[PDB]
Amino acid sequence: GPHMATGQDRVVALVDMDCFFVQVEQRQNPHLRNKPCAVVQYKSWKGGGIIAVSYEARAFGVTRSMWADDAKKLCPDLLLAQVRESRGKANLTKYREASVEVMEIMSRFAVIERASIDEAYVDLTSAVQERLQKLQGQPISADLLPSTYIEGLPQGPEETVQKEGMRKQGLFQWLDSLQIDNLTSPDLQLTVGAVIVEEMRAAIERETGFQCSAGISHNKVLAKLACGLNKPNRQTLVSHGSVPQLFSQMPIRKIRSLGGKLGASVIEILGIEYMGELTQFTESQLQSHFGEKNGSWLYAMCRGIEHDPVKPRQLPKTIGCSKNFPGKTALATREQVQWWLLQLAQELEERLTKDRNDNDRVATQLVVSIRVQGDKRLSSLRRCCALTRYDAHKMSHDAFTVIKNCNTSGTEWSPPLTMLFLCATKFSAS
DNA sequence: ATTATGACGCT
DNA sequence: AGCGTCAT
Ligand SMILES: Nc1ncnc2c1ncn2[C@H]1C[C@H](O)[C@@H](COP(=O)(O)NP(=O)(O)OP(=O)(O)O)O1
Ligand SMILES: [Mg+2]
Ligand SMILES: [Mg+2]
């Protein structure tokens, strides 16, 4: 009763750009705007591999990982923008720089955690407290929440046939039920968080041209889940009270970290399908199947409770360059391996020198990873060496020295390499 | 031949 | 340190 935590202590948002690489290309090329469009990498094999898809193109069934030639069968008028190629490889610099634009705007509002190139978590607890104090007892107008969905609403008892009418009816029920004179009300705190996130999203769109979606809840897992509920160009508030019904039909795999083998094991060992079904197990039972850490996490998460903090980190902690060499193109000679290590190392040096100038830090460790032909894993081997100078020839020579004894017999390289990966790690202030 | 590349856990 | 998992 009075001592059971409810996981309502924080306001956390997850902001995620809508079809991000597509919007970057559409801002640059107005002919692509408001059209079925996708971003592709590498044209020669099957038209290239799609890595981002506009919502207009998704309506035809175009998806990430599809070959462009196959996407064109579903959507003959599909427009395509190609990732830049430099030194024989895809180069993602344009999208990293667009990401920095968005992250720098978000960081004006609150401390962010960079979770991917196109999304960040926001800890809004302090910002909400401040807004609630300057705005004491004032009601919250629906006009301050023009793109917000309240998950689970409307419920109960004609315009509720179009989606915007449903959105507003749900929002009206929520606001009509708020206790606005209670500064410690979790529901009120989430609502003010949503007001701030509307402002944040308006600033992003105003200052970059890019649209995004967002989730607002009490922790990162619920904010991430909420964000996807009403994409694109909308934000969703998931309250603590909404959790039982939301989770009652929510496949386990939809919760972040449960989309792989662990979630599969939860389903198979417990014989359940939905996140809410987890409430019927004791914490010790869950720890017995999934380990102490996972068991405690699952016990809390199925009740809507999670404590993982929004880490104060706007910048990536590693800077890496990778290229696959599939099928017949696998690297089979020592000259080949050395040339591609140099290409990767030259891109890496460019990115590292810029990083040192921008961010006052230097990487101190170089990690080299390879995949051997026939291995299913993303890395067949990983070895590190010191990164003492931002020099591409030195980095590539060192990488070759750490991996060269993976070569069983030469001039020749066997078995052939199907992936090379260089990663700079262990940054220190400079 | 689903690529480029991020974070973090385990031992 | 090096491998495994999960993610966009
Ligand atoms: N598996 C992958 N491989 C390569 N690039 C990828 C990728 N997944 C995503 N990207 C790149 C390309 C993506 O544009 C970007 C962000 O990924 P999302 O946030 O998962 N998806 P998006 O923003 O496109 O659409 P929306 O969020 O509206 O559903 O990262
Ligand atoms: Mg996105
Ligand atoms: Mg994303």
Determine the structural domain holding residue A365 and report its residue range. Answer: 310-430
For chain A, helix, strand, coil in percent to 5 are 45, 20, 35
Question: Which runs of E-coded beta strand occur in A181-295?
Answer: 212-217, 235-237
Residue A327: CB atoms within 10 Å: 9
The nucleotide lying nearest A117 (C-alpha to C1') is C8
* Listed residue (A193, A88, A198) closest to A143, CA to CA: A198
- Do A118 and A225 lie in a common domain? yes
d(CA A204, CA A103): 9
- The single residue listed with the structure tokens 């990162």 is A220
Any ligand 1 atom below 6 A from CB of A95: no
- Do A9 and A155 lie in a common domain? yes
For residue A383, give the H/E element and its range: strand A381-386
- Do A117 and A208 lie in a common domain? yes
- The single residue listed with the structure tokens 């220190």 is A428
Chain centroid to Cα A146, Å, comes to 25
List all nucleotides in chain B with at least one atom under 7 A from a protein Cβ: 1-10
- Do A299 and A215 lie in a common domain? no
Which tokens belong to A96?
Answer: 């990293």
Method: X-ray
* Listed residue (A247, A248, A245, A238) closest to A218, CA to CA: A238
The nucleotide lying nearest A419 (C-alpha to C1') is B3
- Do A63 and A9 lie in a common domain? no
How many angstroms is it from A5 CA to the middle of ligand 2?
A: 32
- What backbone phi and psi angles, to 5 degrees, belong to A315? -110, 145
Which atom of ligand 1 lies nearest, measured to the CA of A53?
A: 24
Any ligand 1 atom below 6 A from CB of A384: no
CB distance A72 to A113 below 8 Å: no
CB distance A254 to A225 below 8 Å: yes
How many angstroms is it from A52 CA to the middle of ligand 1?
A: 6
User: What residues of A form the annotated binding site?
Assistant: 16-17, 64, 118-119
For residue A30, give the H/E element and its range: none
Task: Look at ligand 1, atom 6, and give the residue with the nearest C-alpha.
Answer: A51
How many angstroms is it from A187 CA to the middle of ligand 1?
A: 31
SS3 A382: strand
How many angstroms is it from A414 CA to the middle of ligand 3?
A: 38
Which CA-bearing residue is nearest the C1' of C2?
A382
- Do A65 and A125 lie in a common domain? no
Residues after which chain A has a gap (C–N > 2.5 Å): 157, 410
* Listed residue (A12, A10, A15, A11) closest to A214, CA to CA: A15
Provide the edge-to-edge strand list for the sheet that holds A49-53.
A49-53, A37-41, A79-82
- Do A109 and A204 lie in a common domain? yes
Distance B2 C1' – A90 CA (angstroms): 15
The nucleotide lying nearest A322 (C-alpha to C1') is B4
- Do A332 and A357 lie in a common domain? yes
Domain count, chain A: 4
DSSP β-ladder status, A85-86 and A79-82? unpaired
d(CA A20, CA A173): 33
DSSP β-ladder status, A79-82 and A37-41? parallel
